[PDB]
RNA sequence: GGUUUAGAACGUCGUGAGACAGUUCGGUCCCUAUCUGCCGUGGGCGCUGGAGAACUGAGGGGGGCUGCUCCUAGUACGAGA
């Protein structure tokens, strides 16, 4: 019946500001989980999370996009844990697309910059998070 | 080709010959370079015995243009775009 047991179910989101790399990311997950042969970036329009034309164009994710995956482990140490992974806009003219998303996910990885780290969005992220109180951890 | 010759016509002006910052069709453009100038190219003598060569370099000239793509780098700046 079911293909993966519940304990090995991730559901997480990776909000944070904008060009905080919370694309670039998934696409180094499609990757490395093999799900995607190309690693892409978003400049050229590559990304797949990006498939609305304006997000190609404008290199902005103006949506949310949900992928999952199977990441074993680094050292297949897992059996392969299917992680459910909303990528979120961070523009906040789309708002509702990462409280859309949030109350779903049941976990957060919140992007940052190394350059800058806490900026604007990334606060506005951080609040939404607290509403719908996601246990979160953070990829700078 | 145009402009302003001789032909012809139109509109207009004049009685007319003709004329018009009116138009229209047609209508012959010569010169073997003496001098300067310039581009090349030599003959003479000179540079202090004659010759063969290799140079130095005053000075003179030539040349000096730029696009696009990628890279730095989606980096700086920008809440973003
Ligand atoms: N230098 C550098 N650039 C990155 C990194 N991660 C992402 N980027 C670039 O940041 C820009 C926007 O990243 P993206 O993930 O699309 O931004 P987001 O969709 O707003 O998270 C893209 O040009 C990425 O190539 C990184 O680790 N280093
Ligand atoms: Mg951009
Ligand atoms: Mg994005
Ligand atoms: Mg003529
Ligand atoms: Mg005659
Ligand atoms: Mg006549
Ligand atoms: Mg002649
Ligand atoms: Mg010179
Ligand atoms: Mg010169
Ligand atoms: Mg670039
Ligand atoms: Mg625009």
């Given at each position: 019946?079911?293909?993966?047991?519940?304990?090995?179910?991730?559901?997480?989101?990776?909000?944070?500001?904008?060009?905080?790399?919370?694309?670039?990311?998934?696409?180094?997950?499609?990757?490395?989980?093999?799900?995607?042969?190309?690693?892409?970036?978003?400049?050229?329009?590559?990304?797949?999370?990006?498939?609305?034309?304006?997000?190609?164009?404008?290199?902005?994710?103006?949506?949310?996009?949900?992928?999952?995956?199977?990441?074993?482990?680094?050292?297949?140490?897992?059996?392969?844990?299917?992680?459910?992974?909303?990528?979120?806009?961070?523009?906040?003219?789309?708002?509702?697309?990462?409280?859309?998303?949030?109350?779903?996910?049941?976990?957060?990885?919140?992007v940052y910059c190394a350059v800058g780290?806490?900026?604007?969005?990334?606060?506005?992220?951080?609040?939404?998070?607290?509403?719908?109180?996601?246990?979160?951890?953070?990829?700078?």
């Open positions: 019946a079911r293909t993966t047991p519940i304990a090995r179910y991730r559901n997480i989101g990776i909000s944070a500001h904008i060009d905080a790399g919370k694309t670039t990311t998934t696409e180094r997950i499609l990757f490395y989980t093999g799900v995607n042969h190309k690693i892409g970036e978003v400049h050229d329009g590559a990304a797949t999370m990006d498939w609305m034309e304006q997000e190609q164009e404008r290199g902005i994710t103006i949506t949310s996009a949900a992928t999952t995956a199977f990441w074993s482990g680094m050292a297949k140490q897992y059996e392969p844990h299917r992680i459910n992974i909303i990528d979120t806009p961070g523009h906040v003219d789309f708002t509702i697309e990462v409280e859309r998303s949030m109350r779903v996910l049941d976990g957060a990885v919140m780290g806490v900026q604007p969005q990334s606060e506005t992220v951080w609040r939404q998070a607290n509403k719908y109180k996601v246990p979160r951890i953070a990829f700078v």
